[PDB]
Amino acid sequence: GRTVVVLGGGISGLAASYHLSRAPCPPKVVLVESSERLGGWIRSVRGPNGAIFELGPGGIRPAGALGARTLLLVSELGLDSEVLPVRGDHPAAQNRFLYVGGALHALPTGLRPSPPFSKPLFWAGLRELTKPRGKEPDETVHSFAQRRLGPEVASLAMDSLCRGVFAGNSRELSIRSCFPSLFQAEQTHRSILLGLLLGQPDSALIRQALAERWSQWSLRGGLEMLPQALETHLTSRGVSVLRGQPVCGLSLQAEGRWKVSLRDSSLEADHVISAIPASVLSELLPAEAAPLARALSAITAVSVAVVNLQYQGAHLPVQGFGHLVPSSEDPGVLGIVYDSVAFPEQDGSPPGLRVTVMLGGSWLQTLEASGCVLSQELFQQRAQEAAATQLGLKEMPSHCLVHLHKNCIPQYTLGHWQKLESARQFLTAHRLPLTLAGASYEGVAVNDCIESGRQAAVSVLGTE
Numbered sequence: 001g002r003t004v005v006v007l008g009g010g011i012s013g014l015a016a017s018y019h020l021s022r023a024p025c026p027p028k029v030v031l032v033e034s035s036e037r038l039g040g041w042i043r044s045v046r047g048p049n050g051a052i053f054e055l056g057p058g059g060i061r062p063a064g065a066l067g068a069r070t071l072l073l074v075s076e077l078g079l080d081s082e083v084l085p086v087r088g089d090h091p092a093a094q095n096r097f098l099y100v101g102g103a104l105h106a107l108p109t110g111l112r113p114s115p116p117f118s119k120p121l122f123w124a125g126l127r128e129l130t131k132p133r134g135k136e137p138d139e140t141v142h143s144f145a146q147r148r149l150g151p152e153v154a155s156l157a158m159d160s161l162c163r164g165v166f167a168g169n170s171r172e173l174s175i176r177s178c179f180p181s182l183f184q185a186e187q188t189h190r191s192i193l194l195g196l197l198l199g200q201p202d203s204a205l206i207r208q209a210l211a212e213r214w215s216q217w218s219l220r221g222g223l224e225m226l227p228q229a230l231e232t233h234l235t236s237r238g239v240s241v242l243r244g245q246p247v248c249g250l251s252l253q254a255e256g257r258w259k260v261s262l263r264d265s266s267l268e269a270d271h272v273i274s275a276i277p278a279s280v281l282s283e284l285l286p287a288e289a290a291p292l293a294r295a296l297s298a299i300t301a302v303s304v305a306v307v308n309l310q311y312q313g314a315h316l317p318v319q320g321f322g323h324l325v326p327s328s329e330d331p332g333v334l335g336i337v338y339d340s341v342a343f344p345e346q347d348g349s350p351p352g353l354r355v356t357v358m359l360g361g362s363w364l365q366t367l368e369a370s371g372c373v374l375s376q377e378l379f380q381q382r383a384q385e386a387a388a389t390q391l392g393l394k395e396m397p398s399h400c401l402v403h404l405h406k407n408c409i410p411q412y413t414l415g416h417w418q419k420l421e422s423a424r425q426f427l428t429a430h431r432l433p434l435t436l437a438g439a440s441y442e443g444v445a446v447n448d449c450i451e452s453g454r455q456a457a458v459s460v461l462g463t464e
């Protein structure tokens with residue numbers, strides 16, 4: 001007798017529906033997805049020769065309690081046979097690079113001046129402990145990193161790191177919202193290094209991932225198998241999924257029920273879990289909820305072009321996960337991922353070398369805001385020049401895939417904590433049967449989006 005609608009069929013929406021429907025005494029769950037497919041940015045292409053090309057995340061890092069919570073989900077979905085781990089005894093696990101000064105340079109692990117840093121990194125760690133503590137509520141990743149680590153580390157490492165995780169600009173991103181652990185470390189223990197030196201579910205898959213030290217894992221038919229398995233389960237349990245059915249409007253009525261408004265249809269939800277972009281939810285809210293909508297509309301997302309390239313009979317200069325490209329090296333190219341190093345099983349046959357070029361940054365930000373045309377060709381040449389320049393691959397790619405993802409990665413810029421705090425004070429102040437979830441709020445990683453989903457699910461079952 002209690003209906004919960006879930007908006008968005010991304011991984012957050014999917015996870016929420018999954019936990020809701022698995023409760024001992026489950027409400028009626030309806031999943032509402034605006035596109036033809038579930039899975040949101042998690043999407044995979046099974047090319048001609050049998051190779052997988054990832055269009056979003058290519059694999060997932062299992063480390064952390066969240067890492068472990070996702071491997072459990074995977075066990076529960078009986079996907080174990082299908083898992084492709086990358087084990088601690090491989091280069092794809094023990095090697096991330098930087099393209100700096102026309103060369104790839106290896107980032108250290110824990111073991112002498114390493115290019116492109118002039119001095120040993122031991123020295124920055126030093127002044128790190130002795131350094132004061134920022135007294136502001138928030139701070140940009142650049143400001144933070146620069147202050148505690150020095151100009152070199154900030155301009156190269158943190159700059160790249162923000163690009164690799166958020167496809168974003170570290171002079172924009174909040175250190176509080178982007179690296180909450182680094183931020184609490186510093187705040188709590190007056191020092192990043194200390195807070196780290198001053199510090200989990202279980203199952204067979206996890207024990208194995210702990211033992212073999214998996215640095216990441218993916219699925220054999222591609223990551224999309226995850227949302228695929230999830231959807232199969234929802235549908236089994238009799239959860240109701242509506243594709244190609246965008247939500248147009250939300251509004252409350254009597255008895256405090258929600259009227260979800262479809263194109264030419266409607267649903268009454270007792271509760272609503274929003275797992276769609278915050279900027280979208282914003283446009284769906286009744287003027288009753290202006291101050292919340294203002295908060296939501298303040299959360300924006302960058303775009304990303306993904307270009308997959310496959311080269312027949314080519315080889316890389318190095319073996320690693322991939323490399324990052326600092327903004328000072330290239331505004332448009334964020335990094336390249338060597339998918340074959342990690343997942344040779346997905347190379348097809350005849351097997352071919354696969355890399356994935358991530359395009360974005362200010363290059364693409366300004367093109368979006370221009371009269372210019374965002375052609376496939378434009379992204380193709382960029383990607384190819386990058387592989388040719390940065391990887392010495394001057395062969396024509398035997399295969400090529402180009403995808404522009406508009407507004408796909410939420411940017412947690414300065415003041416983000418406040419936006420969240422405001423949305424959350426409005427919601428509770430007025431006791432709205434609405435829960436928030438997904439990448440717009442408390443993390444963009446798939447691991448985060450899932451926990452995001454589970455927490456919204458749990459909190460919704462708490463209410464009844």
Ligand SMILES: Cc1cc2nc3c(=O)[nH]c(=O)nc-3n(C[C@H](O)[C@H](O)[C@H](O)COP(=O)(O)OP(=O)(O)OC[C@H]3O[C@@H](n4cnc5c(N)ncnc54)[C@H](O)[C@@H]3O)c2cc1C
Pocket residue numbers: 007008009010011012013032033034035039040041042055056057058059060061245246247248275276277280304306405408409437438439440443444445446447449
């Ligand atoms: C190329 C790239 C690489 C990435 N790599 C990694 C990585 O490897 N590791 C990692 O952890 N994370 C990675 N991510 C980030 C991560 O994939 C995303 O943050 C996460 O998948 C987003 O999930 P979500 O459910 O929060 O949002 P989304 O996946 O965007 O889902 C939201 C859904 O809501 C739907 N929707 C919108 N409006 C409506 C409406 N009105 N009615 C009904 N439905 C609606 C949309 O169609 C969409 O499907 C990557 C992202 C990108 C794109």
Ligand SMILES: O=C(O)c1cc(Oc2ccc(C(F)(F)F)cc2Cl)ccc1[N+](=O)[O-]
Pocket residue numbers: 095096097163164165166167168304321322323324334335336337358409
């Ligand atoms: O660490 C990374 O996240 C890393 C990401 C790379 O590719 C991306 C994947 C995803 C995104 C995303 F999701 F932010 F768009 C950006 C980039 Cl550059 C390439 C290399 C690395 N790395 O550590 O060597």
